[PDB]
């Protein structure tokens, strides 16, 4: 009776096949044919997977060798002229767009070195897409040359007897998520809707002309705060596509709240809508009302971005809540977003203890979840599944892993006091000058040093258990002292240890905290072929033993100069994980802050009184719409950082580093120093911007002359008593002969300013 849907499936493979064959192809060690073949093998595998599973609406064109948005750009001829002046073939021009083309010179052709198009975070997901990139010259048209991807693949699956609903991005989200190319900075992308809509119609005709009665059209910018110049175009664009010679259209949104844009899409000639009810369940009533008799409502109720075993009772209730408002015949049960944002299969999980594996459910498991739910509401008997599922829910609600009594009592202790330093900055600053008697324009470093073949082989051979613990505790010291001496030679004032002992700035902390579980194949596609294996916060978080004390303490004891302890902020640790979904992001960020505070304490007690704490993840986890949520997030974000840093003596100096950060947040941290990255361009937007920050600032510019020059114009607006000097972020990814030069040039510049 009630159909089940899936908006998309991860194409990387269960054994990361896609990473293997694509990297292969780029590296000369596999042929186009072999790629395509493997591609065909996964699409086929996954199509069949979903069918065996019971899924009724199964997606096609959801697969990509790199990125779906990029496929669309290639299919509509949104292809900057540069990538054609290279006699390259289709799928090659496609990779060149997303990865770049660097050739050694010849005698015929020069040294072509075209860079790749901008990589943009897909909303607030962990996925990244190629920014669509248009010129004034841009001539939109279907590339029948390369073949019509979405059609070729709809057939392919038809062939295997799988009738799929092709997924493509709507023309509105596509244009609005794009940008003007280099040679047209005046161009507004949404201006182009009239140039593109034809191309869309034509592709929608070939799909129909090939047996696609259904097409899922993606328009998730609808969950964003949109201009009128955009939201007024949905009417224009969808009156233009629908008709008899094209498939029915399902307008799909996910990730957020479409309410504020309802009136932009309440009079649309489409067959139905998909709404994310996992993220915004509250929005049920409003959205469903805009439906007109005949229109269908896809009810995303199985999470497509997390890994929790869905709670069928509630998920069903939500679907029912929707059914008893548009009718059993018009509701479709669906994953909330594409399953792209989920790992492939919980079965590949070997080390994971079963009791917790019992709470999980990756992409594969999720297919069986929409199907069991679609039945449940359909009225068929699935009492066996329900009883079982209900139990995993109880198992998890009552498990000790999820209710840490000591942590819960500790949350009680969170108040204004605990979120505030013992004295304001100007007072602390008095004590700190007394402790450190540093010079004007103090020099310092930010993070990792360039990493040697051994530094990595070592850590590796220590996990892979091929080397003694003494052999290892030794190697790291030998790099630590090497990095400490190096710094004293160039002449830095405050030093870092070099972090030879650390791997992921999150994984490294995760493994040392309670409430964290890890996977062996929990891979999620991130950009191109780079995947990630996020930790999973599976319960109440706490710190049992110290995490970073030992290596910092050794480094400090071999130099008279202040040593920096290096931590990661609670919010970034939360963002770069799979969060619990039984408790608020705020409550998990607070627990993490509580745990980090134990670490910060223990660093201080050990004579590490200069502690750096990074949150490169703040803008990333910024709620998609301005409003009450966005503002609150910014509060508990600063609150989380302060809870982790507000127990230190005034003499103890808390730093924080930023590359990408959020002027509100920074202001509310109360960091003794914030080191920021500046550019020669966004300077007018940057400099003036920190007439704000009350406290000290690490001006990170990025020649000894061009350093002075730079600093000089910053001192035409600020007191020199405010600033430390430091590198950008891009020194970790730089060679020693480069570092030694830059780090010496910078140190030298700030030497000139002490003389003056």
């Amino acid at each position: 009776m009630v159909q089940s849907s899936v908006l998309g499936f991860p194409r990387i493979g269960g054994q990361r096949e896609l990473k293997k064959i694509t990297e292969a192809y780029w590296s000369g060690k596999a042929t186009v044919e072999e790629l395509l073949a493997k591609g065909k093998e996964l699409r086929e595998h996954n199509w069949k997977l979903q069918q065996k599973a019971g899924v009724d609406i199964i997606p096609s064109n959801d697969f990509s060798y790199y990125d779906q948005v990029l496929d669309l750009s290639l299919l509509f001829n949104a292809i900057p002229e540069r990538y054609t002046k290279f006699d390259l073939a289709p799928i090659d021009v496609l990779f060149a767009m997303g990865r770049g083309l660097q050739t050694t010179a010849t005698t015929t052709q020069a040294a072509v070195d075209v860079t790749a198009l901008e990589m943009v975070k897909w909303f607030d997901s962990n996925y990244h897409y190629v920014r669509p990139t248009f010129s004034h010259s841009t001539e939109f048209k279907l590339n029948t040359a390369a073949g019509i991807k979405p059609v070729d693949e709809f057939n392919e699956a038809k062939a295997l007897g799988v009738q799929t609903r092709p997924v493509i991005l709507g023309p509105v989200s596509y244009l609005y998520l794009g940008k003007a190319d280099k040679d047209s900075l005046d161009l507004e992308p949404i201006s182009l809707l009239p140039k593109i809509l034809p191309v869309y119609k034509e592709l929608l005709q070939k799909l129909k002309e090939a047996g696609a009665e259904q097409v899922q059209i993606d328009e998730p910018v609808l969950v964003l705060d949109l201009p009128e110049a955009v939201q007024s175009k949905f009417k224009e664009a969808y009156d233009a596509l629908v008709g008899a010679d094209v498939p029915e259209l399902i307008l799909t949104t996910y990730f957020g709240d479409v309410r504020p844009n309802l009136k932009a899409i309440e009079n649309l000639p489409v067959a139905g809508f998909h709404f994310d009810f996992v993220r915004v369940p509250e929005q049920l009533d409003e959205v469903a009302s805009i439906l007109k008799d005949g229109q269908t409502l896809s009810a995303g109720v199985v999470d497509g971005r997390n890994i929790w075993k869905t709670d069928f009772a509630k998920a069903s209730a939500v679907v029912q809540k929707a059914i008893e408002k548009v009718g059993k015949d018009k509701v479709v049960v669906a994953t909330s977003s594409s399953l792209l944002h989920t790992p492939v299969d919980l079965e590949s999980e070997t080390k994971l203890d079963a009791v917790i594996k019992d709470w999980f459910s990756f992409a594969t498991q999720k297919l069986d979840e929409v199907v069991v739910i679609a039945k449940n509401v359909s009225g068929e008997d699935v009492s066996k599944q329900l009883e079982a599922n209900a139990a995993s829910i109880k198992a998890r609600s009552e498990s000790s892993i999820t209710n840490d009594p000591k942590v819960q009592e500790r949350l009680t202790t969170i108040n204004e006091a605990l979120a505030t330093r013992k004295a304001a900055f100007p007072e602390r600053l008095t004590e700190q000058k007394a402790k450190y008697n540093l010079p004007l324009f103090p020099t310092t470093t930010i993070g990792s040093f360039p990493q040697t073949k051994d530094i990595r082989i070592n850590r590796n051979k220590f996990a892979k258990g091929q080397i003694t613990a003494e052999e290892y505790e030794a190697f790291i010291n030998k790099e630590i002292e090497t990095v400490v001496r190096f710094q004293e030679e160039i002449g830095l004032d405050v030093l870092v240890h070099g972090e030879p002992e650390r791997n992921d700035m999150v994984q490294y902390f995760g493994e040392q905290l309670n409430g964290f579980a890890f996977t062996t194949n929990g891979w999620v596609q991130s950009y191109g072929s780079r995947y990630v294996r996020p930790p999973i916060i599976v319960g109440d978080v706490s710190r049992p033993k110290a995490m970073t004390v030992k290596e910092s303490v050794y480094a400090q004891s071999i130099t008279s100069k202040p040593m920096k302890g290096m931590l990661t902020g609670p919010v970034t640790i939360l963002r770069w994980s799979f969060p619990r979904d039984d408790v608020s992001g705020k409550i998990q960020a607070l627990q993490l802050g509580l745990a980090l505070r134990d670490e910060v304490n223990d660093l201080e007690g050990a004579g590490i009184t200069v502690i750096q704490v990074d949150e490169p993840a703040i803008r990333e986890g910024l709620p998609l719409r301005a409003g009450k949520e966005r503002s609150d997030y910014l509060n508990w974000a600063a609150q989380s950082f302060r809870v982790a840093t507000s127990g230190v003596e005034n003499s103890t100096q808390i730093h924080s580093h930023f590359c990408y950060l959020d002027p509100n947040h920074i202001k509310a941290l109360d960091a003794d120093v914030v080191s920021i990255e500046f550019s020669k361009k966004d300077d007018p937007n940057y400099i003036q911007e920190f007439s704000e920050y009350p406290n000290h600032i690490g001006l990170g510019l990025f020649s000894k002359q061009e350093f002075v020059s730079r600093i000089e114009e910053i001192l035409k607006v600020y007191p020199a008593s405010k600033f430390w000097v430091n590198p950008d972020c891009g020194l970790k990814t730089r060679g020693w002969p480069e570092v030694k030069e830059s780090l010496t040039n910078m140190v030298e510049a700030a030497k000139e300013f002490r003389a003056k």
Side-chain angles (χ1 to χ4, degrees), residues 1-19 21-28 30-37 39-47 49-51 53-71 73-80 82-84 88-90 92-100 103-108 110-111 113 115-140 142-143 145-157 159-178 180-181 183-184 187-190 192-194 196-207 209-262 264-281 283-285 287-291 293-306 308-319 321-322 326-327 331-350 352-355 357-379 381-383 385 387-393 395-396 398-399 402-405 407 410-411 415 417-421 423-432 434-436 439 441-447 449-450 462-463 465 469 472 474-475 477 479-480 482-484 486-488 491-502 505-506 508-529 531-544 546-549 551-560 562-586 588-600 602-618 620-627 630-650 652-660 662-666 668-675 677 684 690 694-698 700 708 711-712 715-730 735-737 739 745-747 749-750 753-755:
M1 185 78 80
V2 170
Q3 262 180 323
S4 69
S5 190
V6 167
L7 284 67
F9 204 72
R11 60 272 192 167
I12 55 176
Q15 314 316 323
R16 300 183 302 128
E17 297 73 352
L18 190 57
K19 175 166 194 131
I21 175 72
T22 58
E23 269 154 5
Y25 173 85
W26 301 324
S27 58
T31 63
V32 161
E33 296 77 17
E34 290 185 323
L35 186 47
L36 300 186
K40 195 180 158 303
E41 187 178 330
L42 296 132
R43 299 184 300 253
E44 164 164 345
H45 176 278
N46 290 313
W47 275 326
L49 194 67
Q50 292 173 100
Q51 180 185 99
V55 157
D56 306 82
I57 316 197
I58 311 172
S60 94
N61 190 48
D62 67 323
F63 163 103
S64 192
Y65 290 132
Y66 202 82
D67 172 42
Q68 53 275 355
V69 189
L70 184 61
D71 296 323
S73 298
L74 187 94
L75 166 59
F76 297 150
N77 198 79
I79 307 177
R82 45 206 203 259
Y83 306 89
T84 60
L88 267 180
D92 286 307
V93 160
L94 174 90
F95 288 126
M97 260 163 63
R99 276 181 65 250
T103 64
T104 58
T106 72
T107 88
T108 44
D113 198 284
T115 190
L117 305 186
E118 183 195 359
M119 153 188 112
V120 186
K121 178 196 166 63
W122 177 249
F123 292 75
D124 62 336
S125 77
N126 279 318
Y127 176 79
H128 284 70
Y129 72 96
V130 187
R131 173 68 64 73
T133 292
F134 337 107
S135 289
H136 288 313
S137 61
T138 296
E139 188 211 341
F140 292 78
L142 286 179
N143 271 17
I148 294 172
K149 181 177 181 302
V151 170
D152 291 346
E153 298 186 7
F154 164 66
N155 300 328
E156 169 166 332
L160 324 200
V162 200
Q163 193 72 16
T164 63
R165 184 166 74 171
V167 188
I168 68 197
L169 203 50
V172 167
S173 281
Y174 176 73
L175 294 179
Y176 175 73
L177 298 181
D181 205 354
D183 58 341
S184 313
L187 180 50
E188 289 154 350
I190 199 95
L192 295 162
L193 198 60
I196 206 179
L197 273 175
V199 183
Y200 263 92
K201 183 74 180 193
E202 187 180 352
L203 164 73
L204 282 186
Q205 280 177 299
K206 311 212 172 194
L207 284 179
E209 186 201 352
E213 297 312 312
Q214 298 287 309
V215 168
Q216 157 183 336
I217 208 161
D218 272 13
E219 284 296 11
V221 309
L222 275 175
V223 291
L224 306 178
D225 294 330
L226 292 172
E228 195 68 30
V230 158
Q231 52 175 299
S232 76
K233 295 307 192 171
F234 287 112
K235 180 55 173 178
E236 160 171 329
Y238 289 78
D239 279 341
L241 296 176
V242 314
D245 60 346
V246 294
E248 290 197 352
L249 300 180
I250 303 309
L251 200 93
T252 321
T253 75
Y254 32 78
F255 293 155
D257 193 332
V258 281
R259 288 181 283 207
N261 286 326
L262 282 184
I265 67 163
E266 62 189 9
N267 194 30
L268 291 192
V270 289
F273 295 97
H274 176 80
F275 302 117
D276 186 337
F277 294 154
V278 170
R279 172 89 181 83
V280 198
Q283 96 189 300
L284 186 56
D285 300 331
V287 290
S289 76
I290 75 143
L291 284 202
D293 205 81
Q295 276 177 337
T296 46
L297 184 157
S298 195
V301 294
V302 167
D303 207 328
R305 279 163 75 198
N306 210 335
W308 297 99
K309 202 179 231 235
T310 293
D311 178 330
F312 297 150
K314 309 188 189 174
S316 290
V318 164
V319 178
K321 191 175 171 197
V326 313
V331 188
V332 178
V333 157
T335 60
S336 57
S337 56
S338 156
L339 296 180
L340 167 67
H341 312 321
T342 311
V344 178
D345 202 345
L346 177 60
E347 286 323 297
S348 325
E349 283 319 314
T350 40
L352 264 181
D353 201 88
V355 177
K357 212 169 177 291
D358 178 52
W359 303 344
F360 293 1
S361 179
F362 307 4
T364 288
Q365 298 54 46
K366 283 176 179 315
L367 297 170
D368 292 290
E369 287 185 356
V370 279
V371 173
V372 171
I373 288 157
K375 292 189 197 163
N376 195 252
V377 306
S378 279
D381 190 42
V382 293
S383 66
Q385 299 85 324
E387 288 181 290
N389 182 266
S392 309
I393 303 290
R396 170 186 172 185
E398 302 158 13
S399 158
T402 32
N403 304 322
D404 186 328
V407 169
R410 194 187 231 239
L411 275 157
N415 72 358
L418 208 77
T420 314
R421 289 284 297 268
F425 175 72
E427 290 66 32
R428 307 196 302 259
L429 175 47
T430 275
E431 302 199 29
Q432 287 166 3
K435 171 152 187 147
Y436 309 115
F441 287 101
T443 53
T444 191
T445 46
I446 288 161
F449 280 107
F462 182 59
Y472 170 93
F475 178 88
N477 294 9
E479 295 296 287
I480 275 183
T482 289
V483 142
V484 159
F486 169 105
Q487 290 179 77
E488 306 214 59
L492 303 154
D493 294 284
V494 186
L495 313 188
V496 307
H497 75 236
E499 286 173 60
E501 94 271 20
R502 306 177 180 201
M505 67 187 301
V506 171
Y508 175 84
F509 291 93
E511 296 165 325
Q512 314 191 41
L513 292 175
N514 290 0
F516 267 73
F518 295 75
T519 67
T520 72
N521 286 267
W523 294 106
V524 168
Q525 174 169 25
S526 186
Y527 181 72
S529 57
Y531 309 175
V532 295
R533 215 172 55 222
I536 308 190
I537 297 181
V538 303
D540 288 343
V541 167
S542 47
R543 218 264 283 125
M547 320 187 292
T548 69
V549 173
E551 304 82 10
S552 269
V553 169
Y554 167 72
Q556 172 74 95
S557 73
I558 72 175
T559 170
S560 37
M563 184 77 27
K564 252 163 158 183
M566 306 279 323
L567 301 179
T568 285
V571 178
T572 299
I573 281 171
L574 180 60
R575 294 298 308 187
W576 292 357
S577 287
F578 276 115
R580 297 169 63 179
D581 67 6
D582 57 318
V583 303
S584 79
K586 171 185 163 99
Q588 294 176 96
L590 289 184
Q591 288 183 353
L592 275 161
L594 282 183
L596 285 155
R597 180 187 192 101
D598 284 12
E599 188 68 0
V600 174
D602 289 15
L603 283 183
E604 188 192 60
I608 311 294
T609 54
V610 168
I611 296 167
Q612 179 176 321
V613 186
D614 308 316
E615 297 271 35
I618 291 288
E620 271 180 28
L622 191 79
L624 296 156
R625 276 187 191 292
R630 184 181 272 171
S631 78
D632 277 11
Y633 163 71
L634 290 179
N635 261 39
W636 61 264
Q639 182 191 353
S640 271
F641 188 91
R642 291 194 319 264
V643 165
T645 46
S646 288
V648 296
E649 301 292 349
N650 304 324
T652 268
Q653 177 154 79
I654 302 303
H655 289 220
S656 184
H657 181 57
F658 292 109
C659 321
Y660 358 84
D662 195 85
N664 294 305
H665 178 247
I666 304 186
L669 302 181
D670 198 16
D672 300 322
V673 181
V674 292
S675 44
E677 255 180 354
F690 274 99
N695 299 3
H696 281 45
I697 282 200
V708 180
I711 287 180
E712 257 160 9
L715 269 196
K716 303 160 60 155
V717 64
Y718 294 116
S721 40
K722 197 177 208 62
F723 302 81
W724 304 43
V725 201
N726 39 30
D728 46 35
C729 279
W736 282 104
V739 165
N745 278 347
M746 162 204 108
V747 155
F753 294 94
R754 306 200 187 106

